[PDB]
Write an enzyme that holds these catalytic residues in place. Structure first.
Site, PDB file in Angstrom:
ATOM      1  N   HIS A 161      -4.475 -47.874 -19.874  1.00 45.29           N
ATOM      2  CA  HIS A 161      -5.294 -46.470 -19.102  1.00 45.29           C
ATOM      3  C   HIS A 161      -5.391 -46.593 -17.696  1.00 45.29           C
ATOM      4  O   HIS A 161      -6.569 -46.612 -17.307  1.00 45.29           O
ATOM      5  CB  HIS A 161      -6.627 -46.250 -19.837  1.00 45.29           C
ATOM      6  N   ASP A 179     -13.420 -40.900 -25.256  1.00 41.94           N
ATOM      7  CA  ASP A 179     -12.670 -41.617 -24.488  1.00 41.94           C
ATOM      8  C   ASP A 179     -11.730 -40.354 -24.062  1.00 41.94           C
ATOM      9  O   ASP A 179     -11.504 -39.579 -24.802  1.00 41.94           O
ATOM     10  CB  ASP A 179     -12.023 -42.538 -25.349  1.00 41.94           C
TER      11      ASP A 179
END
Lengths: 371, 371, 371, 371, 371
Positions: free
Chosen positions: C96, C270
């Site tokens: 990420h 998320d």
């Protein structure tokens, strides 16, 4: 002993009181079976089928009724048949004597000994000859409801099971007995969302188990009934009181609040119906409007699926048929108390308490006619 | 850009080409929606429902047809409507131009730019706007079949699911596509024993997995098909050849060998039928006899459950509707190949090859009308 | 070549990037596996289990990071770990990079060659290493929703499945991908009535077939979504768009019209969440109020069932791990295009377009780093 | 006659002893229903809902207790309430007089005539007012066990149903009665593998038939129990002995051999527990460790889903409530032997044998108080 | 063009290469079908059945072989039949030429043009003519395993499904393809607890969905496989490597650790087997011991249910048979690339790559034989 089965004469009654299977059983025990030519046609049983199993086909009703010691029917004797009733003859069929003084009079007048399907009752209180009819009607109700929900028939125009992305029909079944269970099962199978209402929580517990979550169940307070009926596309009335009147659970003012086009099916229509707006209808004119909704109240519904319901009924009556044929009525009745509860008439005597009280006079004679 | 929706005028068409859902979506994007007063009634959508969602209610057809840049319909333009077709106007609906030279001539004469629901095709060859009508048809077929199986309607008089101790109906479904899967599933839910026939074994594999043993599958050789049809109480014709004419799979002589009272439902009836004896019927005269069996061939069946089918159709059309309203026809068609395959007509030009060849003359122009 | 697995250091991350099964596979192929002692404890894998499978236990993190050619993790390097990044080292984990300026710089700086789990992508567009995490999250969401619906936790106080006679919970699942499918399945299993909303009808068709009638499906127009949400006791947001930011489908005004005590679970938390009121929470303070409703937004949910998720994740990563171990990173990446899509960092260069074109500057260098 | 319902005073008791549906029934029979303002809040029933159904809203508790002829509660009168008990007043609630000498005293002292929900017993030995609380408990147990199985809560960190390729949780349910059946059903629904242990094989046969193979059954010898418990991730103790003490079936040395992180849920906690290590816990501190396992022993578990459990309870109590309101207690108790078994107190006399014998002295007075 | 079908000569091969269904299709398109008297007896198809569908029955093998242009068989030509191979004749059957140089020689020698069922392959890589044989084998494996698990046969003596209160059998299936899926399904239906192992998680996902919780799935590492196998009462080897040799997944030292009496069934025995100890057996001596376990390795298993497997096979071959009959081999092959994949021999040329470069010399000739 000789057993006879006439064609059903009532309009739109397509059943017959025996099948080849039953014919075979009686023949093998050396009884003779007399069947009116044509009697099984409404139920898709040909004369050939009956002959093959040992029956003697006979050209006329008259000849069946004179000649038979035991006469098997589906419906009660009609006006035109009163003349045929006889003295030393056992008649076994659905009687519903309470609903016809005329019929009751004809029976005790002719001194016929008669036994009613509907009051044959086992020790545990079950009515085994009605149960199959309740299964049929329950399953039928779901089918007719589904069809009459099409806009083409005046209904709201919703498909039972929706299609992916679109809500299915919302169905409520009032009553969790045999008929209600069977209607629920078939509606569910068609993909509708089904809720059943009863005041017996054990009956609701069975329904909950059998379908895991699938069939919803609700405690039937008037308050919860109103709420459920208000949202329903299809309502099925399936509260069948064994031999009483059937309570009116849905009021006309409540129907005035339902969605336009909703359909209500009254399985309880024979024996009174259980909606207040309810009234018996016929095959050709099956529905009628009440405030924007459509009522379906066809009397005698199991008759519309005669190939199924003839077998359903005669499988249940068979053991009792066999006992009568082999032993004659007293004896059979002394041996079998379920049978004895069915005794209605013998040589002028009225043997049913509910009927005697209810139908003005005659007066009972318990059963002591069994010397 | 302005979007208009007229009441459907064909008789016994009860659907409408938009729902409040769709109205709200269009409004939110700043398009004006013009709806003919009363347009949603057959589908139990009131004017108030449409108003609430942002729609402008309009008293007459003419006012919707003039005024609307994009015109949404369910059926093709009827004779009485030919007069209303306009030049700078996109019309989106089921067209079936191959079935009517009169209709195609009216379209190219008026120079209207038209897109057909039934030829919108995605890269994988799916026809996403027909699919939901096939789902509806398939599920409907099982319900109508079950109903017309009653003796009361001329059928053999068997209940779909039987009752304990008694055999259920034997149902065969020809075709394992969307329609056939859906017919099979609803009939199986009603308790009938169901066999589906298809030449594609992978499709039969899917049905086998989905139902574990429950739905029987058979490879569809003529020999096997005859065997299965000969035993059926209920036969459902579900072979929908997507844009061709649908093979004739059940011959009249084969029907001469079926059980008396069997019912055959032909879902393939629009587009030709798939029984030899097939012929379009109407809602008030739905069935007719062929050799002792009963044929059910109602055209345009999805229209009889309009509350369900309006939503099933409009949910499928909505994303195309939105692309059209936002970008206009060219551009929407340039962006979206599936939409492009639907292009039929533009300013006198006929843009469909299957149609042009089939319909005698006019002659194609591929799509280069997209300069 | 030598493979190393450090203990996860982020707080409340309990998983480990390999299991004994994986260690055994690697060992059998003659690679050395170095595991930080205690690494498997959160996941109930003991040091002895690792040892038995052939692993070398090692006392400190530092010793795993220096020494390993291929470093396997579950989460991204944390601040305290930036010092441990090396030059001739492949790092394989969830990265990420988009979400962390600092992290990206660290990786570039150190010249580490790194491959991200979440952008490993097969020719058909699937994200095979994220899929198992969505399975876990979907299933977990139904569990957590059930619990927090207790009054004792602030919820409206309804049991998911009701009890005979009493309504079950009304659950809506938004999104019918893997997470939504899984949430709907478990919710349904608990006896709730479940509706899933999505804009892709084919996905609704799969859900409909899999459960026959049982899981309701609805086309996801805003209109339809608002109607569904207003009636819900539990709402589960399961719209995870592949690698973008997740649309806000439930507005605060919408939540203001929900039943008091309803709970909303945002699996898309998320990567942004898909309710407007949504905000990452932690395991000790998992919920917060929004107008009389309860939101549950715990970040990093699969980590709470580490014994399951560890296996789910590492079964999916295993073949990619074996390819890298056996062939080194280029060659593995040339052989295997899915793996090459995961390439993120090499010798100072940033190899991902979405991240370059999102995290201000660096600039891509397609993959040409594969000379 | 006048019926009163006070708010529940016990901490963390959220239910209420009547719903609008029940108020409506009582009202239409012309009784006066006094409800303390706010009483239904915990169960999401507003005072508006109660008032709509015909209830008189009343500002204080004392106003309800004096004024009400029949007083309906959910729990036993608490210390602060003893002052409110009156002479010519029927009290109907869960009593458990056995567990509080203090309570019992207050009851006989004030000469109140009280009937206990948990001793109401039908001819067949069913306790129909406990049943619905068992169903709730059993269903709850599976949800709370699932939740506490997360590492984040101290459990071993396995998801109930696993995900493809990964083992689900091993659940064992001890006891195959109503609670056991309902826990097993929900656990199975959540995808876990479930074994139930009982010494009654008939009850095992019913579970076997109901789920075909799905729920495993094992005969409950100590040996077999030891084996099952040692492998389980979750154990649910569901042996609720009628009105006795509940046997201790899992000993602490046995728990010492269980997997670390296993969770044990004791539904039999009210009435003693059925694990040796068991001890009543509260909602804010629900669990505690016993040798590396986690015990969950929340008392009074049905209170935590009050919207569900209020209806479940009050549906079951309603027909008794109606009999009392219409007939007064003597007469109701003559009429209905199930009610009579509930009789516990009248004008200083203690009417229950099991409690007289068990709570030191007072001594019985059979029921002769029904002169 | 004329089509011939010989009786199968191989010992204990009971199938036949055509059914009446197929005969009828051929006949209707004007092909004459020659069938050897007695050909269909093993599969319960009489000469009368074949005659009724249009077949010409013929007394001798020789007469079918000379006379037929297209010759259909089930197995490859045996020694005694080499003499009957002809020049201008298409032979269509299972060949497995790689397994026999003798057979391959005979085919090239006689100049026959031959096509193998086993290498017919569709664009997507499916082998449509093996699939149905895999379905049969997988279903059979569960039946044979269940049988040989009786002590009476040397197995451990456990019933597949157990009985209430008693553990069912523990079954492991290795391979989640068509055979493993089918073995899993049947074992499960017998009530056993079933785990399937595969390396392909997507295949595991399909099984998980199809049975909800019911069929357990495990990722197939060596480590996991060992664990599963050690605990199993029955193991079914179902890894059918399409045209390769099938990996040996269970070692003899692993079997040395299995429970005494366990049974292992190798569906992959044709084509090599997938257990190390595997070894082809015969119908009369079906099993053999390997360290206290029982192996079941009957070759050519589909032949033992010839009524089923004849139809399954000939349904799949039929469309190919019709194309050949109607068009001749070249042309059928040019129109149909799946068929072309099957081409093996023509006029002395060997046309299969895998076979040429596997069977020592001859050398390919791609397909250029299609001038």
């Amino acid at each position: 002993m000789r057993v006879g089965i006439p064609t059903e004469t009532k309009n739109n009654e397509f059943r017959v009181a025996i099948t080849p299977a039953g014919v075979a059983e009686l023949t093998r025990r050396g009884h003779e079976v007399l069947i009116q030519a044509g009697a099984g046609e409404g139920s898709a049983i040909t004369d050939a089928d009956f002959k093959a199993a040992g029956a003697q086909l006979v050209g006329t009703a008259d000849q069946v009724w004179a000649d038979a010691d035991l006469l098997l029917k589906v419906k009660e004797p009609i006006a035109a048949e009163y003349g045929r009733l006889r003295h030393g003859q056992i008649l076994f069929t659905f009687l519903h004597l309470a609903a016809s003084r005329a019929c009751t009079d004809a029976l005790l007048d002719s001194g016929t000994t008669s036994i009613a399907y509907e009051t044959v009752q086992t020790a545990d209180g079950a009515l085994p000859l009605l149960a199959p009819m309740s299964e049929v009607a329950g399953r039928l109700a779901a089918q007719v409801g589904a069809y009459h929900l099409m806009r083409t028939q005046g209904g709201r125009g919703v498909l039972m099971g929706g299609v992916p992305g679109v809500e299915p029909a919302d169905v409520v079944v009032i009553g969790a007995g045999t008929a209600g269970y069977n209607a629920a099962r078939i509606a569910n199978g068609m993909g509708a969302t089904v809720t059943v209402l009863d005041i017996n929580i054990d009956k609701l517990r069975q329904l909950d188990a059998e379908f895991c979550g699938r069939i919803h169940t609700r405690y039937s307070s008037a308050y919860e009934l109103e709420g459920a009926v208000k949202r329903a596309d299809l309502v099925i009335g399936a509260v069948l009181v064994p031999g009483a009147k059937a309570p009116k659970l849905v009021s006309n003012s409540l129907v005035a609040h339902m969605k336009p086009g909703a359909v209500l099916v009254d399985i309880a229509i024979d024996q009174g119906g259980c909606f207040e707006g309810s009234r018996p209808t016929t095959y050709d004119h099956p529905t009628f409007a009440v405030h924007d909704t459509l009522f379906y109240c066809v009397a005698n519904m199991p008759a519309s699926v005669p190939k199924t319901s003839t077998y359903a009924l005669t499988n249940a009556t068979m053991p009792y048929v066999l006992e009568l044929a082999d032993h004659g009525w007293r004896a059979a009745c002394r041996s079998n108390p379920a049978l004895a509860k069915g005794l209605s008439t013998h040589e002028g005597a009225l043997l049913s308490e509910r009927v005697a009280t209810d139908l003005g006079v005659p007066f009972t004679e318990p059963a002591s006619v069994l010397a």
